[PDB]
Symmetry: C10
Subunit: 75 residues, 10 copies
């Protein structure tokens, strides 16, 4: 049955091709997920930058306000 | 039956290949969901950082205000 | 009693079982991913409402104080 | 005499049953996922409106006190 | 004839199966849409509850302020 | 052509089934879009209710504030 | 061949049916896009209604405020 | 083969039909994208209208505020 | 040779060429739609931040005046 | 077998075509992701421009107020 070994060769060609295509698709999808994640992270960092830089100033000012308030309250 | 054992072999080869492809695809989908979840969680933490850090200060200032209100 | 037919039936069952097994694995994967998405969304929500919820008792107290002063200054 | 036909019929039937069962399983899976999404969305919403709803009665009473003051001074 | 009646039965089996699968999918899609709609509606009700409940209070207060303002204004015109 | 008319019959059975399936799918999609639209419209109405109900009060109060402000500046 | 022209007829029936099904799907999707668009436009109008109705009042009140501020200054 | 010529003819009919159906679907998706774009642009204009109309007024009021501020 | 094969090869090439063309048409369509979505998103964003950006210079000027005033009213 | 080598040529033609199609799809999807990313990044930059530009001003003003306040509580 040369027919059988031949058929096995053709079948394997097809299966190997399908597996290669699937692998490239999976890799593509993971790369795209990478890009989406990187973009989302960088976006979030850019968005929170100002509130994070204002933080220490707002804490300092709040504390000064409390000191003032309590001073006035006592007298 | 040699011929039937042969057809059975080819069939099994195809079925194993299809199953392997499905498994790699499923694993890919789970890894992507993992990336999306980690990204979403970290974005959320980054976003709520400042309000969480202002918490204790806003509480102390509210308390001070209450003392002042009750005085007046 | 048809050997050829029993053979065809066996091969057919192999393919159909494989297709079913693949379907089951895909469905399980989809359900697990939905579980991940759910867990993440819930934890995100908890993280977001944390500050809100923590300020609640203080805001109620301060509102009560404002009312105390308002009513005292009325009549 | 129609044995070949009854055989082809049996095979076709096996395939069709299998397809219908797979569709049924996919459909049930989608329904279950929708239930999960709905439950999560409902609970998220409850968690979000909690603070609002707890402040409500205070905001109403403070408004009423303000009104009493305004009307005295009017 | 015989082969044809046979063939027509096989064909009909496939067509009926495909139609049933399509109907099951349509019903499933509609059920899911019903769940999403009910959920969205209930979420919206929960969200607008507080502002709706503040409405009458804000209206009464605004009216009070208007009365006070207009009085304070009219006393000098 | 007997066999050919039989062929046309089987073929048309297929074509009609496919057209019926497609028609029912299209109807389903339209119904779902109708539900989504109705839901979105009602959600929107519920959300803007308070806003809209406060409108006349806010306008009246604003006009009052303007009268007050202007009276005070044409005082001093 | 007569067998040919017959086969061509069957083929044509199939192709025409596939084209018709596709066309009805396209029309369905366009109708749904039309519903989504109309719903989104009306939602947006409902949402911005209060904003837009308050606009003139906020403008007049700002103008009054500015006149007040200018009056209360002592210079120029 | 005359049979081959006929076969090639049926094939071409099928391939052309598939290409036309694909073309019609693509045109449909693009028209829908056009509708979505036009809708989103108009929604955005409607939304920012009030903002943009308050601009000149807020700018004037800020300027007056500055004149008051530096006078004390 | 095998003329039947040459025929078969031609038919197969017609089909493959067709499939590839259809795939290219779809890829190009998806890219054009991405272009439309991006241009729309960019213009929407510009329209949205217009007011913000136009108030910037006034808010900066006013803040600067406030700083100077604070310095003058500080002992 | 010449017949086998022929079938092998047809098979390979089909498989190569399928691989080329998949590659073109993958490339297209990557390109679209790139457009979406560039767009989202530029949108974000446009959005945060104003608050970033106000930052230094708000910091200086905060410092001034704090100095004033602290001097006053003494």
């Amino acid at each position: 049955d040369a027919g059988f070994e031949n058929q096995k060769e053709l079948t394997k060609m097809q299966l190997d091709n399908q597996k290669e295509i699937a692998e490239m698709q999976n890799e593509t999808q993971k790369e795209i997920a990478g890009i989406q994640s990187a973009t989302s992270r960088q976006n979030t960092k850019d968005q929170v930058y100002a509130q994070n830089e204002m933080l220490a100033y707002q804490q300092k000012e709040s504390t000064a306000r409390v000191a003032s308030i309590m001073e006035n309250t006592n007298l």
